[PDB]
Amino acid sequence: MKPYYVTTAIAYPNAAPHVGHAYEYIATDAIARFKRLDRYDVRFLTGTDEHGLKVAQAAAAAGVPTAALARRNSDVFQRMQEALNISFDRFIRTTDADHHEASKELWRRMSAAGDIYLDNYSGWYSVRDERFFVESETQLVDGTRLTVETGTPVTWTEEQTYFFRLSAYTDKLLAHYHANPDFIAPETRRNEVISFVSGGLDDLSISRTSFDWGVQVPEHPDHVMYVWVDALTNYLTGAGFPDTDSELFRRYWPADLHMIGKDIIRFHAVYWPAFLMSAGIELPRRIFAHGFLHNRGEKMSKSVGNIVDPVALAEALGVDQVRYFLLREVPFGQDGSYSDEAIVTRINTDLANELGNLAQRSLSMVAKNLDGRVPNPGEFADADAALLATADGLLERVRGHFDAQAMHLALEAIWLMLGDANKYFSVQQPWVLRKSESEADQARFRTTLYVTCEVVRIAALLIQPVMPESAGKILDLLGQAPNQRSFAAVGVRLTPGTALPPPTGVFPR
Numbered sequence: 001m002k003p004y005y006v007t008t009a010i011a012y013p014n015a016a017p018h019v020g021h022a023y024e025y026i027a028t029d030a031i032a033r034f035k036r037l038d039r040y041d042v043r044f045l046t047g048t049d050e051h052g053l054k055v056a057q058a059a060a061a062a063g064v065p066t067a068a069l070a071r072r073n074s075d076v077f078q079r080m081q082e083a084l085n086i087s088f089d090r091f092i093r094t095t096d097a098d099h100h101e102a103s104k105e106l107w108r109r110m111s112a113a114g115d116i117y118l119d120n121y122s123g124w125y126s127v128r129d130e131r132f133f134v135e136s137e138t139q140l141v142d143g144t145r146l147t148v149e150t151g152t153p154v155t156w157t158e159e160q161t162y163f164f165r166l167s168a169y170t171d172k173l174l175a176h177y178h179a180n181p182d183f184i185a186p187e188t189r190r191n192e193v194i195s196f197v198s199g200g201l202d203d204l205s206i207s208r209t210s211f212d213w214g215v216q217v218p219e220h221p222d223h224v225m226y227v228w229v230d231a232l233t234n235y236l237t238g239a240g241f242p243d244t245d246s247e248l249f250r251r252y253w254p255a256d257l258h259m260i261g262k263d264i265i266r267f268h269a270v271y272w273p274a275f276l277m278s279a280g281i282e283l284p285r286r287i288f289a290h291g292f293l294h295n296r297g298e299k300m301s302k303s304v305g306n307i308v309d310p311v312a313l314a315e316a317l318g319v320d321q322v323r324y325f326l327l328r329e330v331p332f333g334q335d336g337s338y339s340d341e342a343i344v345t346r347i348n349t350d351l352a353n354e355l356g357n358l359a360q361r362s363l364s365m366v367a368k369n370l371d372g373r374v375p376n377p378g379e380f381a382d383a384d385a386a387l388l389a390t391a392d393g394l395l396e397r398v399r400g401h402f403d404a405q406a407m408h409l410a411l412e413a414i415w416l417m418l419g420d421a422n423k424y425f426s427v428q429q430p431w432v433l434r435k436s437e438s439e440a441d442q443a444r445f446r447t448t449l450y451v452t453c454e455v456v457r458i459a460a461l462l463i464q465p466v467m468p469e470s471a472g473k474i475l476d477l478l479g480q481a482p483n484q485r486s487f488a489a490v491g492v493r494l495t496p497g498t499a500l501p502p503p504t505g506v507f508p509r
């Protein structure tokens, strides 16, 4: 029962949630659930990042106070995650009181280590990215200043702000990345982060004067904290900071994994660790940056109205079918395309057929031909034993894949096994054998059928992280109790004589 603390990046509630958000929550819910089934004590944090201009500007364009849009749109994210069956332990909002408190304390410590200082800032702020750029990192295109990287507009900003002594931590960071090879995944993202930090870091503005929407800097009410300082702090707040001598913080911090997307990696792999080093806090163990998801182009909303609502998509296709597609279509870490044709055919071949047809055809035979009881198998032939051996070795393989955030390869391995089982079912042809008078073929019918059920049972157990309801539905159909559904149950075979209730379809769609 070792602790495992796993977090998602928290979303700006400035707009409705797109599929990219639901991708991050689903991948992380898969990891969370796998760990619970594998006997870890999981704390799973998600939520919203309610401060900053980006949110304040969306409020004024609506014609409403900022805190109103914050609570309303935060509820939409929360309700969306309920629908997608995200098993978060806490949903953190940055307006929360204890969060305000956690941030003040983090600042107090960075002050107390001599890493915050007042100075004049001049430069370009992108409200859409909540982030500063130097003039070199912007282009003038038809009389409009856009960032070179993202193509987003920028604002000239002259203010007096508190800075963080980020340049002091360049080599301590490089030391850390070197000593902890698995701190940043995937490996492509690691070498990018190492490139940037080797170029040298400049000090970082961490307060704002021009607006009041945010956590006030302690002993300087005239300032609010840069939204990213307070936002990163949510991970500390999710484990009971500032009370560092509490059960939660002692148990769960340091976080075992931050799931984020590749655009916010610098905040998590450079700025966040430096703040923590400054404040004398233990760093997180690992950061996995997942790739973007397109609609044949990045989803642009207004530029191209090609957004994909995951709640619509979940009602359109089923929650579990969407969670399977997102974790199967794309290799986790790389960029990928969503398309309406790709998902339907994926759901059709992988779930409707390879999995669900195999289950219905075996579970129906049990109901018709065997009085709805699990059969007693005899001596397993070599083809039976080879199928049972691949399936008995899945838990180890899938476990390895989940520990590198390669959920896609776990699913591939589980489906290569199902593909063997279908071929096995075709070549053993039990539909022939059930209609026979000799007791040899009747025992042989009972054996083949038992194997197919025992294989499907294993698949169901291992698919619980990705498809909780549909996995559970199959385990119901195989007569499994509510205490025989953890990964310990993978090792314990399907007992002959169990009553299987009358087959209903797992994927009515």
Ligand SMILES: CSCC[C@H](N)C(=O)OP(=O)(O)OC[C@H]1O[C@@H](n2cnc3c(N)ncnc32)[C@H](O)[C@@H]1O
Residues within 6 Å of the ligand: 008, 009, 010, 011, 012, 013, 018, 019, 020, 021, 023, 024, 049, 231, 232, 260, 261, 262, 263, 264, 291, 292, 293, 294, 299
């Ligand atoms: C202390 S963390 C605060 C983070 C900050 N609050 C923030 O970044 O706000 P956010 O609401 O835009 O968060 C979006 C998250 O979803 C991913 N993402 C977004 N769109 C995506 C897409 N189309 N495809 C794939 N991934 C996507 C993206 O990488 C990011 O991780």
